[PDB]
Design a protein around this ligand. Structure first.
Ligand code: AMP
Ligand code: MG
Ligand code: MN
Length: 330
């Protein structure tokens, strides 16, 4: 029985999604698993997307200020985890920021900054504490979500890829697979060990924040771990010499002014790594270190504008610098 390596990639959830698997199972079993991975990603785009009119999320947003809406258990659990990270991060990560994001968004398409007052009004509609999750305790009791504040809008952009990466890992595992690299628009989950039959940790790349993306600046060897990076240059537009990126500081309503160029979070669950990466980017380095003390099972790697790199204890020894312009502090 021989080891074989498979990959498959498709444009879905608005980005390139790729899954690579090593397996000794019959090829047909791997093919079935990958078929289901990409079916899932198609189905979940229609549940979670904040920028399609026809998604379950859009439907829920349409009911802001009205009666509770029934949701499936999966979406409920994701919202629960998002609100947990909102609270722990003091709202640096905020899953109800749609009123503001949507105002900037159109800025992106047609390169214009929002309007002062319009922006201030939108900020009044982003209180994630007004998202009420209820689930009864009896058999088959429904799960519901109520957006209490009129005009408030969920946007799960900062946690949905993490959630989907976790869902994919669970799916692979259900198909008796135990070696894969899941890559959803750069949101990585390294499942198990790869093959060289020599077994090796996955070598996960981290990009130069100002690079053309082609080559990684650094690589970190990991097993059974998500690696998710948030950065100031993954998405932005420029107007009159100022750059405006996609990660909003909920206090200002503007793209976060922060002291790091990127933050990469290493965690057993990609949902958690994704939420934390965004929170940390917003909070900046010192406040991130403080927040991260709450989550002992997580590691983090910060790339600074001066190309210094700092990594926490659990991963620093597994980091290798590939672009010598960067320096790993020890
Ligand atoms: N502070 C924030 N908290 C949560 N979601 C955000 C925030 N700022 C922007 N977003 C949304 O989440 C995306 C960024 O997620 P990420 O790339 O995971 O940091 C943005 O493109 C927005 O859709
Ligand atoms: Mg995120
Ligand atoms: Mn992300």
């Amino acid at each position: 029985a021989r080891v074989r390596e498979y990959s498959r990639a498709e444009l879905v959830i608005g980005t390139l999604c790729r899954v690579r698997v090593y397996s000794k199972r019959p090829a047909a079993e791997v093919h079935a698993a990958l078929e289901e991975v990409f079916t899932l990603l198609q189905q979940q785009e229609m549940v979670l997307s904040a920028n399609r009119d026809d998604s379950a999320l859009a439907a829920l947003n349409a009911q802001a200020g009205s009666a509770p809406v029934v949701v499936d258990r999966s979406l409920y659990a994701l919202l629960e985890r998002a609100l947990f990270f909102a609270e722990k991060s003091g709202g640096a990560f905020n899953p109800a920021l749609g009123a503001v994001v949507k105002l900037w968004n159109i800025g992106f398409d047609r390169a214009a900054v929002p309007d002062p007052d319009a922006l201030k009004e939108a900020l009044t509609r982003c209180d994630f504490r007004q998202v009420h999750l209820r689930a009864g305790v009896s058999v088959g009791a429904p799960h519901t979500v109520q957006l209490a504040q009129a005009g408030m809008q969920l946007d799960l952009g900062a946690i949905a890829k993490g959630f989907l990466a976790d869902k994919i890992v669970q799916l692979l595992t259900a198909h008796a697979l135990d070696s894969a690299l899941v890559d959803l628009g750069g949101n990585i989950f390294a499942l198990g060990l790869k093959y060289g039959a020599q077994r090796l940790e996955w070598n996960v790349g981290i990009r130069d924040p100002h690079g053309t993306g082609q080559k990684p600046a650094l690589v970190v060897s990991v097993r059974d771990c998500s690696v998710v990076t948030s950065g100031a240059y993954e998405r932005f537009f420029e107007r009159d010499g100022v750059r405006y990126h996609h990660i909003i500081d909920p206090v200002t309503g503007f793209p976060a002014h922060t002291d790091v160029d990127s933050v990469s979070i290493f965690a057993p669950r990609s949902t958690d790594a994704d939420a934390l990466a965004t929170a940390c980017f917003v909070l900046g380095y010192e406040k991130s270190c403080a927040l991260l003390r709450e989550f002992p099972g997580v590691d983090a790697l910060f790339i600074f504008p001066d190309k210094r790199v700092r990594a926490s204890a659990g991963i620093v020894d597994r980091v290798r610098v590939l672009d010598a312009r960067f320096v790993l502090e020890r």
